[PDB]
Symmetry: D2
Subunit: 319 residues, 4 copies
């Protein structure tokens, strides 16, 4: 019942645990970045560019998250969609955490104003040798914290840690993320499937037959609903809230899927498992995949357990 905010949640789960403060401040700083990304995505100031005072979003998001993570004095390696190679933090500002993020996911189609988001996934540095790109190559199992911000009909940050998955709604009136769902867990089975079917020609037989099973029920029930926005963050958030399954399977145009492991697949897979769901690559679990490159693509099928398991059974049959 009693109120609580994202700032207080992270400075109290971090308070009530050892207390180095770096991860508290990293997350602290990270929401402040997201709040700034939100106002820019809501186009708050477009009038000054169009002549109110008189005579980039994907780039600006990357700058904000980087800048802030750097100033947090808690990051040593930083991997992003935009920056090809990793970003080794200047000595002065280094901490002990490796952060992998997609600063604006879906801005390929931001000109139609579709829901976009910010995906993040925090690792701690295991190695002793001087920081490097290779420190980002940890398996998804090793995620200290992951989550995503959604810039949709409203802004929401979904934080996943060992203590569970907690969903915060940005009240733009006060500039504060408000806790509106505690320790969320996904439905066991849903009525929704999320898939780009223009690649129907190029599907695995198992993916094809699972969709046929959903479209044309094999147990004389009701067919599922198709819901594909075109931005992972939105579809996954629906898959959390409403239940169901999300699929970006391996094609032939993309033999390894399209969604990147380190900063797209793994963070969403962590959120799913920490909330009673599951995510798999078909053959191995997304979190158990060991990266060899930081921009490594991966197939990913995440969502409600009784559905992903149904998929997985069909994967047995077609392998």
């Amino acid at each position: 019942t009693d109120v609580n905010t994202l700032t207080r949640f992270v400075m109290e789960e971090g308070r009530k645990a050892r207390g180095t403060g770096e991860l508290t401040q990293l997350l602290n700083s990270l929401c402040t970045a997201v709040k700034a990304i939100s106002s820019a995505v809501r186009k708050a100031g477009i009038a000054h560019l169009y002549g109110i005072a008189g005579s980039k979003l994907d780039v600006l998001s990357n700058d904000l998250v980087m800048n802030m993570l750097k100033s947090s004095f808690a990051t040593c390696v930083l991997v992003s969609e935009e920056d090809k190679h990793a970003i080794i933090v200047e000595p002065e500002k280094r901490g002990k955490y490796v952060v992998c993020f997609d600063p604006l996911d879906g801005s390929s189609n931001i000109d139609c104003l579709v829901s976009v988001g910010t995906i993040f996934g925090i690792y701690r540095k295991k190695s002793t040798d001087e920081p490097s790109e290779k420190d980002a190559l940890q398996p998804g199992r090793n995620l200290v914290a992951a989550g995503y911000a959604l810039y949709g009909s409203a802004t929401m940050l979904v934080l996943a840690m060992d203590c569970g998955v907690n969903c915060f709604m940005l009240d733009p009136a006060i500039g504060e993320f408000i806790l509106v769902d505690k320790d969320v867990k996904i439905k066991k089975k849903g009525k929704i499937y999320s898939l780009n079917e223009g690649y129907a020609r190029d599907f695995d037989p198992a993916v094809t037959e699972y969709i046929q099973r959903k479209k044309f029920p094999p147990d004389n029930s009701a067919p599922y609903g198709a819901r594909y926005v075109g931005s992972m963050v939105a579809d996954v958030h629906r898959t959390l809230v409403y239940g169901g399954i999300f699929l970006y399977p391996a094609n032939k145009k993309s033999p390894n899927g399209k969604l990147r492991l380190l900063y797209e697949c793994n963070p969403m897979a962590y959120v799913m498992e920490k909330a009673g769901g599951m995510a798999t690559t078909g053959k191995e679990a997304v979190l158990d995949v060991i990266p060899t490159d930081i921009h490594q693509r991966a197939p990913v099928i995440l969502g409600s357990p009784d559905d992903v398991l149904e998929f997985l059974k069909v994967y047995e049959k077609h392998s």
Copy 2:
């Protein structure tokens, strides 16, 4: 040389003679659209969840209703959220009929997916005293029509005889900034939009069209698939990037789902004033004369060439 909706709306009105009522209708309407935005972005949510201690469908409809009522430019008012028509009280009557969906796609509003307002303004056909028949005009007679997208940012799209204009809201000052003038649509796209969870129930014409897209017949490249589940969001994508949108008829919806007067007709008028088309398969959406204010209709809108590619497949199976 900044050009706001409120400025646009009274120069296009002055550039079209006439009283000034429609300007003040669109002013009141967009003021309500600004207040829907505020609630949809969840401003004040902390007070509900107990920052001091201790519904959107309805709120959105109340905002639109009170604003259009107070505008002195409405006689009949038709909404999703009202089974009957709203005969505006005589002291506040105007010369226009507004058919609107206050918040479209709110069924799945809890996933925080793009919702929107849809509207379409007619001019009274009445001679004496208004009635719900004034809303029962074909889409061809639409004075003005458009929508507002509460997505990545809030955009009002306004189609009129002078064309389709897109205004971005600037939340900092609450002004709609003209960012796209007289918009026209790609002649053909690589996007298709429908709910394939009804594939069991689709017409043979529909099914073949999708096979043509999933499996190009001319050995080109397969089209793309996008169904947000919200008409504003899908229509606006079909406007911006191009492509095709369908919510066709099937056996368990012989008349589609999407309503005529406050969903299909408004989006058809946008598309046709932007160079796209909009058909039910047999008539064009704007050419259906309604019999019921909550009448349902099939809709296949989008880029011109794409709807033509459909209509050829449709005629073959009929």
Copy 3:
């Protein structure tokens, strides 16, 4: 009755009079600049000046950016011909493409000299009409305040409020920073006939002529054995004048030695607040004549001003009438 926004009220009243629509157009563009000023004064985006994104239009002083906003909104309205401002020594003649009927005199950000202490500041405006038959010039701004089509201010205080005086009367609108509309909160307001506040800079006590020095003692030591008036001086005209509109009372900025002909500017401070006051049942006097009756010879002309509640202003006037 029902909700109303500044936007309809302006374009409603501008249709109840047929009318060109320029005044409506002007009042809108002026409004839109006012919301813009408010958002900058509330320091929105101050974080992008302090390294939020790392590196970089508006590294401007707020009083300048305000002026630029009001200017580039007014010119673009196609309703203005001559524009007078405090931040401009000469009147701005609008280009022949965007010329209109009305002459506007304004103070973009009044009180910004102490905006460091975050004091209430505001935008004072006043709309005349070109009465001249010849091309626009700084002469056209030299009209008496009697010839005001409309006047008012926007107070950027605990909240942002636009006060609009016309022949209608005075109409108070509050900005809802959520939706970005001015909401009609008070309609056709009038001032309290008499009040219990007095407002002036008593640091200039050494240079007060006897009329002021007596009246002030009549308030601190009342003659009728009643109760002393309260002393209230923000140091920002929009602030003190607005309090005098809501609570009643009196506001004085008179003749000194340092500035013997007043300080407060006539065309874009005194005259507009006099129109507000007179249209709301109050008075505004120079001591000699009434403020609205003063005949300008220069655009940046100063003037002594004593405005406020009717009984209060007249009480002072009897005291000045003893000394002349």
Copy 4:
């Protein structure tokens, strides 16, 4: 390199080890201030005037209250708006005592004058059970104090033993941005501030001192009068531009009007830390042992040389 208050209030804590409770207090306090600013600037005023169909003292108090109880860092809470010391429920208790005025100057708020939230943080010293007594500490024992000014913009002024620090609220992101660091006051000023309507009732000492500033002794230049009527507003001017602020004993209030624990004592700590001075004419405001939570006190604060000059005149007449 940006510095927010959520960073600063944690950095200082980490540097002093400490549980994390003074941090959470202030972090929770600031969210309350962010919410009060929203209310004061009239966000949602449209809905009170019927945009969709059809108190601030109390809301501000409820906000501070509920946020501080939720902080898990308070045991005793003292406010204007409750004639009682509020003792926090055992499950939500910390070790600090907060004496606060949630909205000061809202007396004269219909004219929209600058208002503000004043606060001061003590630490429970009695081994006893949390009670009103724990708040009756002299201001000297203060861990932290300050105020939130809701004027031109919103600023949180935060005084501690690491100096006084000013934080500007950026409504675009809801973040208090550090803009003036380790601030310090001019040793002498040119501005004076008091209600001269109470002239008939002032100390002969006060009356001389004002003469001494209105008509200078060294026939130099006079000071400038500035009385807003909101202590936060006047005091913040006196922090920035310098000068003096008085609310001395007249007769209707012969022991001052301004409340010691939650009006005078917090402002004294700010001045003190920023190199200023704050006296009752007898003793330092921080050195007044309180008897009642709502106890009033004569307050004279500002630039040190100017406060001393008043004190010189006081000693003559005393």
